[PDB]
């Protein structure tokens, strides 16, 4: 764990890390869209969410 601590520090910020230094969450989880790709919105629904988002309202009766 002293060797891997230096390895995780050496490969920090690198684009390609060794497989044993990558998060081993789950084969299915590793193949999901990243939080960057999940937050990607097309220019059509960016405008649809800008002026046609659900409003906060209340009804008397």
């Amino acid at each position: 764990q002293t060797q891997k601590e230096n390895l995780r520090k050496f490969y920090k910020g690198k684009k390609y890390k060794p497989l044993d230094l990558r998060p081993k969450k789950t084969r299915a989880i590793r193949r999901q869209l990243t939080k960057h790709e999940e937050n990607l919105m097309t220019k059509k629904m960016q405008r649809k969410s800008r002026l046609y988002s659900i409003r906060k309202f209340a009804v008397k009766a």
Partner: protein, 202 residues
Amino acid sequence: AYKYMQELWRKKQSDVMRFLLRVRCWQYRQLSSLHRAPRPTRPDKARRLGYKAKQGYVIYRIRVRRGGRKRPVPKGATYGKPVHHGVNQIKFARSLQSVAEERAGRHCGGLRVLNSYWVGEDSTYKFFEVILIDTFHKAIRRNPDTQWITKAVHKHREMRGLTSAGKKSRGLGKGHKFHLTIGGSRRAAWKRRNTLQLHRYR
């Protein structure tokens, strides 16, 4: 330009298209049964079925042995009642186009079948070009309008009747013609109509 391509492909019995179908069906039967095409033979039909000119969209030409489905029984011996003695005039419940896209998606496990279209016919062969998608290419995962196919729920959609060619064999649709598949599949409807709903107070 694409408007003239689809109206041109509707005159298949014209000497212009009859020549093209004659020389392409010849070329398509000189290659292997499964062969990747460098580009869609029908750019108008490909765009209509979801194909884009991005990186990750591949096209595979499939040659299926057309005709009926012979019952694979040894020497035509179907041991049972005469209703099941049919060995010759038996028709596959799934379309030949569905067999082609299911055959391209099985050879390419890393890709997902998007759609498929007709490119040629013969007395013995039907030729289809299947649109496959590399669901891990960044030109596809970073496009929100096509991130749906990158989900795990669409794994081998051509083998579950989810593509347009395979979904037609399921007999689904809204109306009085499709009372057999109310609730999704026909087995979902059969299981619902054959389940004995024994209530708590009955």
